[PDB]
Ligand binder design. Structure first.
Ligand SMILES: [Mg+2]
Ligand SMILES: [Mg+2]
Ligand SMILES: [Mg+2]
Ligand SMILES: [Mg+2]
Ligand SMILES: [Mg+2]
Ligand SMILES: [Mg+2]
Ligand SMILES: [Mg+2]
Ligand SMILES: [Mg+2]
Ligand SMILES: [Mg+2]
Ligand SMILES: [Mg+2]
Ligand SMILES: [Mg+2]
Ligand SMILES: [Mg+2]
Ligand SMILES: [Mg+2]
Ligand SMILES: [Mg+2]
Ligand SMILES: [Mg+2]
Ligand SMILES: [Mg+2]
Ligand SMILES: [Mg+2]
Ligand SMILES: [Mg+2]
Ligand SMILES: [Mg+2]
Ligand SMILES: [Mg+2]
Ligand SMILES: [Mg+2]
Lengths: 141, 150, 129
RNA sequence: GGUGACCACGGGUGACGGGGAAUCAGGGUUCGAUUCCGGAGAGGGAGCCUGAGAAACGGCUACCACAUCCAAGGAAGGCAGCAGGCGCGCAAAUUACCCACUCCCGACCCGGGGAGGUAGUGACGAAAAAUAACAAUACAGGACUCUUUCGAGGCCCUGUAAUUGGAAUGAGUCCACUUUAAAUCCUUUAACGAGGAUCCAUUGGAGGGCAAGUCUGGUGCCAGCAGCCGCGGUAAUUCCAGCUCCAAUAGCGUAUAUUAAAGUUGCUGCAGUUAAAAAGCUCGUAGUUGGAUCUUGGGAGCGGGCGUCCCCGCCCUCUCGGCGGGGCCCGAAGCGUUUACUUUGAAAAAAUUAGAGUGUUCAAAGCAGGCCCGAGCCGCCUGGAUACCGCAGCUAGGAAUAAUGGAAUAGGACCGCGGUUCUAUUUUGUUGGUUUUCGGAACUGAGGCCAUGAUUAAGAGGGACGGCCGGGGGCAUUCGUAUUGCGCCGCUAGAGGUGAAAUUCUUGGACCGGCGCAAGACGGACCAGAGCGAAAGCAUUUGCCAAGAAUGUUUUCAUUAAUCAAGAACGAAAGUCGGAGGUUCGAAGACGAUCAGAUACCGUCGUAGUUCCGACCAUAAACGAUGCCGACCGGCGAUGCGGCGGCGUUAUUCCCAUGACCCGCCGGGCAGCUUCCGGGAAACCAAAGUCUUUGGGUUCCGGGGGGAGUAUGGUUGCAAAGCUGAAACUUAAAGGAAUUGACGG
RNA sequence: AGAAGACGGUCGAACUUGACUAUCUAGAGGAAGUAAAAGUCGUAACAAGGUUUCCGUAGGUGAACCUGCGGAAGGAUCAUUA
């Protein structure tokens, strides 16, 4: 059992903070390795330059091509794969453009049947992908 | 349970509720004292004095008849041993095991019991230091104990 | 070894009450035990108890009335002030209507209602309801 | 010398500290660059002048890094001030007006203030609140009513489409006023200003979680959707649209940090047999935790009414008691321990929080405000509370719990009496001589008194003693058959081995039978849900050596105790080193078989090893997959040891013991059966119970599955390896117990 | 009264060198872990999985794995008779 003495507070707190390192959430947010390994560096979004347009295969029970773009972040110069989350927004994407990529939804974890993709594109050429999809505003042609 | 053994024996002496001296006992307080003085000069430990008095002279408790304990009686006269009786016997057992152990090096069991005995020696010695029975610098040396006891 | 004599007496009468025994014998008696048994009697939770006097720590036989539910102990005797007493009340007592928290104060051993009546905190001992 | 496991020192911080912010049962977890207080800095360091005050930078000097002008001889720099640019970025405003307010500076009613105020940008965020209301017609609905369905109206509410159909209004234009330093905005208030009142609400969804379609048209495992389950391969409730519904609403969606949910960090309050998990075992220092016991009972009218309730009052001492000599009194000194604890009081910035008052037109706010004016009201009444403020420090009451002490070689308390050395004042008032035991302080001798002074001996522990008990340990010794080999003797052609064979041994006598010899192992049957040991483990006889549990105890000591980081002892088997020995078996290896192949299972050999001594290694499914100490909570029959009782049988003897049985009791073990103790997911467990009715003490240790007991560092080892021990990345399950079915060489 | 200047002292920037310590990162080659291919080879584990399985240790083998020694039942026996 656990100690219950009147002057065992030091043992209780020392044991607590030693055991707090054994759950992933505390280890992740207090070690710093996850922060360094994060391509975004603790940022909600990141701008980048479209390096290529690539297609990713779905998982086993699905069968589709997920239209993603390989992007290099303007800060730290890291190369990541960002999903394009609409039906025909890849055509809205061309080569060498600024794209505001954001996390896909669950904190650096792969989402759905897309393997290894944890980011999605939000804006391209400083105009929203939703606005282009809905026709609210057109490309800066 | 036992300090250095897995054992939970309840074998203990049970003192009577009657603190009064039995009316048949005819030895008075001084008579117990001089019997105690005699047997102590003979070279008997206080525990050995109590058993002989109980088994032969019919005193169930020395403290009940004299009002004072056996070791207190010896120290008051001044013939109590310097080493406490229980501490003396622990060193005696430790020396005997040491003597046996040097003849029989392969007795890993005898070595194990030796550590248990010397652990009890140090724990008892700490208590006696705290009560100031023993000198504050009294150490149990494995080498010099063979002459300290026996 | 035995370290909390009160904790052992409370557990013994709790187990005996669960089984349904008319009487229970708690082996090591002490002053705190007698006072703790006294407050239970004055609130009617237990019947007569008799302290058997041997020259050692005596024994106690308690007549269980069967109207007890739990008589636990709070082993680390926390210091309870008058401002955190209600936080102990709702944490331990089943309800605000019945149930008693017994704490040792400088005015003696008594329940929380009376301790508050004479405006004094103290050290938590146990509870019963 | 000083500081350290009560964590020193060192390292990191995406650390300025605090008041405070978010979340909100309680406890907590995060956040505080940011307007108030304190600190620090002015590109990085360093050094100085002046001054009361600076190591000042809208002061100077120097160096470093940048950087400006130059006639190239020199000279001049510091926006982490207000604006405003570049860069960096996911990310953040006008190179505006004014000292009118609040205050600051100055020689000062007069000047100055990018402090600060005002305006501009401003969906950071917060408060209020439009996008419509009503009436009469049609058609349903209502407990409708009138005849008892039928039909109507003496009523009510919704809905669809209409020359309805004339009432109310702002949002907009815009006059003036007001506001203000000057404006703006707001509030006032003119004239306009609503029938798709087109003066047009959006953002996300409609399989489930989760409110809303099993509509229609496209696409056809494609496009795509989908936080998770999942949808789509031609009849999509899920994609792309239309229609229609749903949610919130001037706001809604997404990403990320953080809180609750999370009793998935568990102090409150989690777990550890099988799910992840208790160290192989014991000792042990720090740490944590520790049996019982020292004043209770009796009083007074008051008194929760002696109204036996009980406001309650309780029926420490010595010193001037300040109302050298009064009882008419209450002030000076110490505590006949020291703390923890609890209550009270003091002091604890404001702002923020809770909260008192106050109709801001309500609210967020703010600290304002209210009464009358008949016009003299030549002015009256207020508020600007209070609470909390952790821990530490200060103060006064209480003394229950907890710690700590007093008298044990009395070097003890208290009353005095001796004998000893100094000394403020003395007055044996002219000074000087002074007596000053004078007053108290110096040390010491002899007394009385103290009820003279030691709580008890834990169903706590240690130790002693008694008779036993045990495959407990070490050394020596003895015996057993078997196995292998060898020597003779006999008779024989086979023997061995396998599912079947074969490798192999054999007319030299193999196998078999007999008598011997030698060696090295191993201690059968007895042998058990029996014993002992800390575990590992321990089984031929005998002797020696120490050790031990339990029991017995009217012995002794008297709390000496429990668990324990660090450290230490012991640890099957295999493995390593050195020396002996090597019968059997047998990793490696060889061969014969089997097989589709057969690096194997089977067979014949056979090395290391297996045996002993010495030294390492420290691991096992080291298992009960189950920490230790302590208490409580059913029954029953046995078993081992010790003790205590008893009808009898038996051994001898002439009787008791004493052994062997028989029937019980007690204590301590190994277990078993049983039970609706209770627990548990259940299997099951008298513990794995006494757990939301959660707290006996204390160790170790788990936090979805993998990566991984891996990499690296450290350390131990001759080596093999041991101990300590991540991350990146990946994944929606992996698992546990039970049910049904299927299947089983 | 006194300026330039000089010896010495003291704070001491800065430069050169060396050391230590932090992160980041290249690297021939080597050796792992993950995900998808009804790819190849066998069949080690599950039933007595066709040699019960598993643990520790050691050697061996294309691969799973095999074998020796000790252990466990989480076994395929809670049981086998005087
Ligand atoms: Mg910082
Ligand atoms: Mg701050
Ligand atoms: Mg400064
Ligand atoms: Mg001045
Ligand atoms: Mg400066
Ligand atoms: Mg509108
Ligand atoms: Mg749809
Ligand atoms: Mg949370
Ligand atoms: Mg859990
Ligand atoms: Mg497990
Ligand atoms: Mg200790
Ligand atoms: Mg106590
Ligand atoms: Mg043959
Ligand atoms: Mg071994
Ligand atoms: Mg060897
Ligand atoms: Mg062989
Ligand atoms: Mg414990
Ligand atoms: Mg894990
Ligand atoms: Mg190579
Ligand atoms: Mg196998
Ligand atoms: Mg198999």
């Amino acid at each position: 059992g656990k100690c219950r003495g009147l002057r065992t507070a030091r043992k209780l707190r020392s044991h607590r903070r030693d055991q707090k390192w054994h759950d992933k959430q505390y280890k992740k947010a207090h070690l710093g390795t996850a922060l360094k390994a994060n391509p975004f560096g603790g940022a909600s979004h990141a701008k980048g330059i479209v390096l290529e347009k690539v297609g990713v295969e779905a998982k086993q029970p699905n069968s589709a091509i997920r239209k993603c773009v390989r992007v290099q972040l303007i800060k730290n110069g890291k190369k990541i794969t960002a999903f394009v989350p609409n039906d025909g927004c890849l055509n809205f994407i061309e080569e060498n453009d600024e794209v505001l990529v954001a996390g896909f939804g669950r904190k650096g974890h792969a989402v759905g049947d897309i393997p290894g993709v944890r980011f999605k594109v939000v804006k391209v050429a400083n105009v929203s992908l939703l606005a282009l999809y809905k026709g609210k505003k057109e490309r800066p042609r | 349970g036992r300090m250095h053994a897995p054992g939970k024996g309840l074998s203990q002496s049970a003192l009577p509720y009657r603190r009064s001296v039995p009316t048949w006992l005819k030895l008075t307080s001084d008579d117990v004292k001089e019997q105690i003085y005699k047997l102590a000069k003979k070279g008997l430990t206080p525990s050995q004095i109590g058993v002989i008095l109980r088994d032969s002279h019919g005193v169930a408790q020395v403290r009940f008849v004299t009002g004072n304990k056996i070791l207190r009686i010896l120290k008051s006269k001044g013939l109590a041993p310097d080493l406490p009786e229980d501490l003396y016997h622990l060193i005696k057992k430790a020396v005997a095991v040491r003597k046996h152990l040097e003849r029989n090096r392969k007795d890993k069991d005898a070595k194990f019991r030796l550590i248990l005995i010397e652990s009890r020696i140090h724990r008892l010695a700490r208590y006696y230091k705290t009560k100031r029975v023993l000198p504050p610098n009294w150490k149990y040396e494995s080498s010099t104990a063979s002459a300290l006891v026996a | 070894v035995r370290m909390n004599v009160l904790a052992d007496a409370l557990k013994s009468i709790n187990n005996a009450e669960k089984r349904g025994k008319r009487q229970v014998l708690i082996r090591p008696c002490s002053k705190v035990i007698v006072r703790f048994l006294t407050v239970m009697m004055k609130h009617g939770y237990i019947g007569e108890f008799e302290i058997i006097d041997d020259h050692r720590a005596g024994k106690i036989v308690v007549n269980l009335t069967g109207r007890l539910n739990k008589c636990g102990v709070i082993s680390p005797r926390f210091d309870v002030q008058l401002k955190d007493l209600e936080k102990w009340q709702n944490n331990l007592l089943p309800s605000r209507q019945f149930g008693f928290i017994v704490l040792t104060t400088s005015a003696g051993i008594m329940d929380h209602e009376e301790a508050r009546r004479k405006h004094t905190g103290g050290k938590i001992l146990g509870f019963f309801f």
